[PDB]
Amino acid sequence: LALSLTADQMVSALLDAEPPILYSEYDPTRASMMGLLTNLADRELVHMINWAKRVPGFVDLTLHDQVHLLECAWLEILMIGLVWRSMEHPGKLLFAPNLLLDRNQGKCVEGMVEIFDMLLATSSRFRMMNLQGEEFVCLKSIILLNSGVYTFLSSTLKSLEEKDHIHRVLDKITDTLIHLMAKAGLTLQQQHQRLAQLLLILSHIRHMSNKGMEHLYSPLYDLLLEML
Amino acid sequence: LALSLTADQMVSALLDAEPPILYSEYEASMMGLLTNLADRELVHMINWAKRVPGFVDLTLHDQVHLLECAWLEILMIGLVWRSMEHPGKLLFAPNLLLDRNQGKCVEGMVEIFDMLLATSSRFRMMNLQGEEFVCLKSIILLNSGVYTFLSSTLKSLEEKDHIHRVLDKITDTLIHLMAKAGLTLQQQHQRLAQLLLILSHIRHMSNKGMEHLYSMKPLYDLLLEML
Ligand SMILES: C[C@H](CCc1ccc(O)cc1)NC(=O)Cc1c(-c2ccccc2)[nH]c2ccccc12
Numbered sequence: 386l387a388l389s390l391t392a393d394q395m396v397s398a399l400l401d402a403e404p405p406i407l408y409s410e411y412d413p414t415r416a417s418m419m420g421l422l423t424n425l426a427d428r429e430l431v432h433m434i435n436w437a438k439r440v441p442g443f444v445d446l447t448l449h450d451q452v453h454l455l456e457c458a459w460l461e462i463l464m465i466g467l468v469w470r471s472m473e474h475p476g477k478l479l480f481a482p483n484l485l486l487d488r489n490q491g492k493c494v495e496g497m498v499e500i501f502d503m504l505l506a507t508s509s510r511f512r513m514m515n516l517q518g519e520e521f522v523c524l525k526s527i528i529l530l531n532s533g534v535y536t537f538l539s540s541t542l543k544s545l546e547e548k549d550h551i552h553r554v555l556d557k558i559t560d561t562l563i564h565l566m567a568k569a570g571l572t573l574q575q576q577h578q579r580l581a582q583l584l585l586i587l588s589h590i591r592h593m594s595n596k597g598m599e600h601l602y603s604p605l606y607d608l609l610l611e612m613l
Numbered sequence: 614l615a616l617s618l619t620a621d622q623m624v625s626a627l628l629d630a631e632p633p634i635l636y637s638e639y640e641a642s643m644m645g646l647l648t649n650l651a652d653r654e655l656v657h658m659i660n661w662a663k664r665v666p667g668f669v670d671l672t673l674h675d676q677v678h679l680l681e682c683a684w685l686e687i688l689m690i691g692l693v694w695r696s697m698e699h700p701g702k703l704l705f706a707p708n709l710l711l712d713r714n715q716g717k718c719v720e721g722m723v724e725i726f727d728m729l730l731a732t733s734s735r736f737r738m739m740n741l742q743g744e745e746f747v748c749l750k751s752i753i754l755l756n757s758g759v760y761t762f763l764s765s766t767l768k769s770l771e772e773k774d775h776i777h778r779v780l781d782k783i784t785d786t787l788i789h790l791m792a793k794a795g796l797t798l799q800q801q802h803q804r805l806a807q808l809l810l811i812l813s814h815i816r817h818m819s820n821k822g823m824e825h826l827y828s829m830k831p832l833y834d835l836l837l838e839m840l
């Protein structure tokens with residue numbers, strides 16, 4: 386089980402579990418921004434479930450506890466995926482390697498500009514700190530398990546042994562980061578400061594998710610069930 | 614300045630800045646009972662913000678964006694912190710203790726209630742000490758709307774760059790607190806994480822609340838006159 390894995394081990398199996406590069410699908414003999422979003426979000430979804438299930442401990446869960454998470458964390462895992470490949474492309478959003486975008490395109494829809502700009506903003510942010518792929522996967526994980534921990538169902542008995550399992554996985558993923566930046570050669574002080582700005586950027590991505598939701602909402606449960 | 618303070622020094626001036634406990638103002642309604650009480654808590658927050666080590670160095674535009682972004686978040690963690698010895702209940706004011714059913718008559722408060730109630734339990738379980746709390750409340754002040762000002766012009770660059778160093782300062786403040794406490798450094802690293810990851814749930818709750826607070830449709834005219 387996950388709760389024996391190592392820093393060394395956790396990273397690797399996390400890199401292992403990475404989804405595949407997905408290429409957009411637009412008229413080459415030429416368009417909508419919406420459908421361009423819908424299309425590939427769908428497909429980015431299907432491979433989430435296949436990565437999620439590869440996250441250590443996510444399986445140890447429950448099908449109900451696994452469906453709540455993903456139903457809460459989905460837009461955030463996309464965003465931090467996007468923002469990661471968008472780093473060497475300042476001012477542009479690298480959805481797919483054949484679908485780099487920028488501001489003016491997000492303005493075509495109805496509220497995408499603000500989300501673009503926060504998106505671009507986190508990209509710059511991560512750019513500044515020089516985010517390693519090894520921390521990125523940690524943080525995609527931490528976005529997964531932290532999604533809807535504190536809103537499962539009830540304070541029952543099982544609910545509690547569950548919550549107790551994630552909180553230990555998360556704790557385990559944390560030593561991974563700390564240990565990653567340790568290897569890197571940072572003084573302990575810089576480990577604690579680095580880890581915090583990283584864990585503070587998660588508030589921003591959550592905030593964009595809710596932001597994003599409000600127009601995506603302006604079924605999914607029944608879908609994750611079949612896939613999970 | 615804040616970037617000269619020590620842990621004990623930062624704690625002190627943070628403990629120092631702590632606002633006063635407010636009692637509610639009372640067929641009674643939850644809204645006006647709620648509305649009434651935040652306002653007056655807002656007025657004390659503004660005077661608490663102005664006492665946060667480093668917030669002053671910023672700009673009236675960088676000071677008015679922050680507060681205007683993270684207000685609901687400072688209240689919520691402030692409520693959720695006193696609501697800790699009150700399992701299932703939200704201690705708004707010492708005379709306005711509530712629960713789900715108290716929030717149920719208003720049209721959406723239960724969901725915010727429940728998640729509100731859950732963070733309290735979380736804080737309880739981890740045994741959140743006031744000195745880590747005052748720190749986290751500051752961290753929500755500084756993290757508020759950092760990456761969302763407008764432009765990275767000349768001052769914005771030096772400003773955001775200063776914020777990130779205040780926060781870097783608070784960050785070590787907490788560690789020494791848990792360190793002093795005698796945790797393995799590993800235990801310091803987990804706690805700081807379980808702690809800072811809870812700030813997304815407060816943020817997530819704030820965004821929810823906003824959705825409803827503008828479901829009932831100012832601040833600027835206040836922060837400007839009070840700052
Ligand atoms: C810009 C982000 C999209 C993040 C994203 C989308 C697809 C992908 O492959 C990778 C990353 N969108 C939102 O935050 C909200 C959103 C809107 C949206 C925003 C504003 C107004 C209307 C619709 N349409 C969709 C469609 C699919 C996912 C998210 C979203």
Ligand SMILES: C[C@H](CCc1ccc(O)cc1)NC(=O)Cc1c(-c2ccccc2)[nH]c2ccccc12
Pocket residue numbers: 644647648650651654685688689692705719720721722725726729818819822823825826
């Ligand atoms: C339950 C939470 C916390 C509100 C709150 C108010 C005062 C205070 O000192 C601490 C916390 N409410 C909100 O986040 C949003 C909100 C609503 C609200 C939300 C949903 C439906 C109706 C009303 N009414 C008010 C009034 C004053 C401040 C915030 C709020």
